[PDB]
């Protein structure tokens, strides 16, 4: 039961073009609120948080950004938040998708969400 | 400008869970009309035909299901039809997506539509 995301890798800043119903149900963000955004909003603790939360690991975020910049897959884990602010550990897999011309047209995201017992 | 498709590889018979705008524009089918269905409907001539049309290459259709069954990529070309029944040549690439526990959870479809000489028309 994993979250599934698609970004457009040609448009700047990997805008989301699809999220599955698991993403929606687990994160509390409905598709209409998310398509056209970069996924990094999940690192903010709910919609009033304008900044990445100090508990999401900036070393993992750096590594994601590098894997995307380099056109390679990523696998790791970082803290995300539901729309209502509850914390969620996200075991994230990114997979670049090739259209034809040896170019990356899309990136697929797989999210395996893990409940966390932390007090914020 | 490719069509882009996602299916659920865990649910039975690869129901479509996403198509992009290019798919909609080129095939003439809106997302609402195709979600939850297998893509094979594009091998039928228009929305009211239930079985794959004879001019569709059954050898290629066979190789597509083989690739899906084996969980490997597919690349190839086949005849499809728009919602208005006009023929399409679809250069299709399929890519399985591995979720957790080394399992395929989804398949991605890239459609590059190319011109055919195929013409059934009046
Ligand atoms: C397909 C895809 C899925 C992503 N899914 C998530 C996610 O579920 N949670 C998250 O925190 N970041 C996710 N990201 C990462 C952010 O979009 C962004 O790449 C990351 O924060 C690094 O960039 P930045 O330093 O500019 O924020 C995803 C990225 C892509 C391309
Ligand atoms: C992700 C994905 C995208 C597909 N896209 C198309 C398509 O655009 N056109 C088409 O004729 N078949 C497409 N198919 C194939 C059909 O769904 C079906 O797998 C094919 O006809 C072989 O299976 P069948 O003999 O049971 O019909 C796609 C399949 C998958 C998994």
Author numbering:
A (entry chain D): 16 to 135
B (entry chain C): 16 to 137
Paper quotes:
A plant called Arabidopsis thaliana has a light-sensitive protein called ZEITLUPE (or ZTL for short) that helps it keep its circadian clock in sync with the cycle of night and day. In Arabidopsis thaliana, three LOV domain containing proteins ZTL, FLAVIN-BINDING, KELCH REPEAT, F-BOX 1 (FKF1), and LOV KELCH PROTEIN 2 (LKP2) act in circadian timing and seasonal flowering. Recent research indicates that their divergent roles in the circadian clock and photoperiodic flowering may enable interrogation of how chemistry regulates PAS/LOV protein function to select for signaling pathways. These proteins retain analogous elements, where an N-terminal LOV domain regulates activity of a C-terminal E3 ubiquitin ligase to target clock proteins for degradation in a time dependent manner. LOV domains are typified by blue-light induced formation of a C4a adduct between a conserved Cys residue and a bound flavin (FAD, FMN or riboflavin) cofactor.
Towards these aims we solved 2.5 Å, 2.6 Å, and 2.1 Å crystal structures of dark-state WT ZTL, G80R and V48I:G80R (residues 29–165) respectively. In contrast, examination of V48I containing structures reveals distinct differences that identify allosteric signal transduction mechanisms to the N/Ccap. These mechanisms identify V48I as a residue that disrupts allosteric regulation of ZTL function. V48I positions the additional methyl group into a pocket adjacent to N5, C82 and Q154. The Q154 conformation is not heterogeneous in V48I:G80R, rather, the Ile side chain sterically directs Q154 to an exposed conformation near O4 that has not been observed in other LOV proteins. Density shows clear selection of the I48 methyl group towards Q154. Lack of density for an adduct is consistent with minimal population of the light-state species. Thus, the presence of G46 selects for a heterogeneous conformation of Q154 and V48I biases the heterogeneous Q154 towards the exposed conformation in the dark. Introduction of V48I, directs Q154 to a single exposed conformation in the dark. Biasing the Q154 to the exposed conformation results in disrupted interactions with GI and high TOC1/PRR5 degradation, in vivo, consistent with selecting for a distinct dark-state conformation.
